[PDB]
Structures are given as structure tokens and as C-alpha cells.
Amino acid sequence: HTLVWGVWVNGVDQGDGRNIYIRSPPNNNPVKNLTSPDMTCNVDNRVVPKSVPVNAGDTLTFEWYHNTRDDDIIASSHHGPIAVYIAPAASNGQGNVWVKLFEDAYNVTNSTWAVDRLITAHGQHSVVVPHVAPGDYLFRAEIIALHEADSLYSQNPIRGAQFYISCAQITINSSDDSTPLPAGVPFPGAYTDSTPGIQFNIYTTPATSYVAPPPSVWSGALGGSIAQVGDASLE
Ligand SMILES: *[C@@H]1O[C@H](CO)[C@@H](O)[C@H](O)[C@H]1NC(C)=O
Ligand SMILES: [Cl-]
Ligand SMILES: [Cl-]
Numbered sequence: 001h002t003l004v005w006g007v008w009v010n011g012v013d014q015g016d017g018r019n020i021y022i023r024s025p026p027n028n029n030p031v032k033n034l035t036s037p038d039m040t041c042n043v044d045n046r047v048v049p050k051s052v053p054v055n056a057g058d059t060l061t062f063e064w065y066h067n068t069r070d071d072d073i074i075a076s077s078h079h080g081p082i083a084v085y086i087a088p089a090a091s092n093g094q095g096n097v098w099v100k101l102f103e104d105a106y107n108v109t110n111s112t113w114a115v116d117r118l119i120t121a122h123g124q125h126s127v128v129v130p131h132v133a134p135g136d137y138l139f140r141a142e143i144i145a146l147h148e149a150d151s152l153y154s155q156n157p158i159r160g161a162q163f164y165i166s167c168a169q170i171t172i173n174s175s176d177d178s179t180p181l182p183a184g185v186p187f188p189g190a191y192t193d194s195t196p197g198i199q200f201n202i203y204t205t206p207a208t209s210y211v212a213p214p215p216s217v218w219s220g221a222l223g224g225s226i227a228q229v230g231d232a233s234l235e
């Protein structure tokens with residue numbers, strides 16, 4: 001159970017984005033229905049009045065929270081992967097438009113899930129803004145909590161993988177458009193019951209054998225990380 005408070009750009013807090021530049025849902029409940037339009041940008045997908053200005057090569061940091069800013073972030077039970085996608089705003093996230101900029105599942109060295117490291121990072125994970133065409137974009141941050149993903153939601157609606165999905169309105173101003181955005185996947189549509197990483201047993205299957213849902217990270221992606229960039233507590 002987690003939500004996006006706002007974003008930082010190059011380590012500078014852009015301020016509370018809820019219902020302003022984040023298409024916030026009313027609460028931190030998960031999405032579970034893989035076929036639902038809610039898979040696109042969660043249960044209240046509508047244009048919000050601001051879009052955060054960034055340039056290609058900027059660090060865009062999502063900041064997540066549980067109940068209040070910089071709290072426990074997400075229950076430590078919620079082991080799973082984190083991904084960030086991008087699509088042009090003109091799409092409203094419809095069609096084969098979502099391009100993957102970031103994937104993190106299990107780190108074998110530290111023996112930690114992406115979610116474990118997100119808590120340690122005070123809810124902060126980042127992507128570097130790619131050299132796409134200047135214009136308006138949606139950045140879709142996705143946390144998958146796997147603590148009930150031994151079942152499929154489609155088969156048993158009180159279990160299944162849990163999706164924490166947040167769409168940020170991002171305006172890319174300065175960019176040479178040297179890596180134009182390639183073809184995307186649909187949400188809903190890319191994740192199905194057979195997709196690797198949707199149905200998984202974190203209790204019996206070694207985390208080392210976990211494979212995150214495709215698609216793969218775009219070669220044009222400029223980097224990203226799960227790591228605190230800024231101290232919320234100093235504001
Ligand atoms: C899953 O989503 C589809 C598409 O919106 C909907 O028709 C179906 O009824 C949903 N499942 C449940 C249990 O609500
Ligand atoms: Cl603020
Ligand atoms: Cl749902």
C-alpha cells in the first residue's frame with residue numbers, strides 16, 4: 001500500500017504533486033485486474049493541471065510514501081520488482097505506447113528486492129530523462145508486490161500480484177531527440193496470467209530465479225537507480 005508524493009529533478013524537490021502533476025488515485029489500494037483500464041495510470045486517470053519541466057540527461061526521482069511523507073513507505077512484506085515506463089502524453093497511455101526506462105527485481109549481492117531498497121531509499125527511485133522528442137509525457141512508476149502472487153487474481157480475486165501504479169505529467173523541454181521513442185507495450189495488455197513474474201511463490205522459489213515481466217529496458221534508456229537523492233525531513 002503506497003502512493004507517490006511528488007518528484008525531484010537533479011536532487012531538487014518539485015513539491016507536493018498529488019492531484020497536481022501526479023494523476024493520484026484517492027488511496028494506496030493496489031490494482032490487481034491485469035485487463036482493467038486501471039492498469040494504465042490507476043483508478044483516477046485524468047489530466048491534472050501541472051506538468052514538471054525537465055531536460056534530457058536530468059535525474060527524475062519518484063518519491064513514494066505509505067500514509068504520511070517519509071514514513072515506512074510500503075509494508076516490508078511487499079517484496080517485488082520496480083519498473084518505470086514512458087509514453088507520449090497525446091496517447092493518454094492508450095495503445096502500444098509504454099517504453100521501459102528502468103527495471104530492478106532482486107539484487108543477489110545484497111540479497112534485497114527492489115521494494116526492500118525503496119524503503120531504505122525513503123521511497124526514492126530515479127530515471128535519467130532520455131533524448132526523446134521535446135513535448136509532454138507520462139512517466140508510469142510501477143511497484144509489484146508479490147506476497148500474494150502465488151495465486152492469479154483472474155482465478156482468485158482475493159489474491160494475486162499487487163500493482164502500485166503512478167503516472168507523473170513530465171514536460172521534456174531541452175532534448176536533441178537523438179533517441180526517438182521506439183514502439184511501446186499496452187497497459188492494460190502487456191501483463192497476462194502466463195507472463196513471467198506475475199505468478200510467483202516468494203516463500204518456496206529462490207529470489208535468484210525470479211524473472212520480472214517483460215518488456216526489456218529500452219537500449220535508449222540513460223540510467224536509473226533506487227537511492228535517496230534528497231532529505232524530505234529538511235523542508
Ligand atoms: C477485470 O477487468 C475487466 C476489464 O475492465 C472487467 O471486465 C472485469 O469484470 C474485471 N474483473 C473483476 C473481478 O472486476
Ligand atoms: Cl511542497
Ligand atoms: Cl483491481
Ligand SMILES: [Cl-]
Binds near residue numbers: 034
Ligand atoms: Cl488486457
Ligand SMILES: [Cl-]
Binds near residue numbers: 059126128223224225
Ligand atoms: Cl539515477
Ligand SMILES: [Cu+2]
Binds near residue numbers: 001002030078
Ligand atoms: Cu499493501
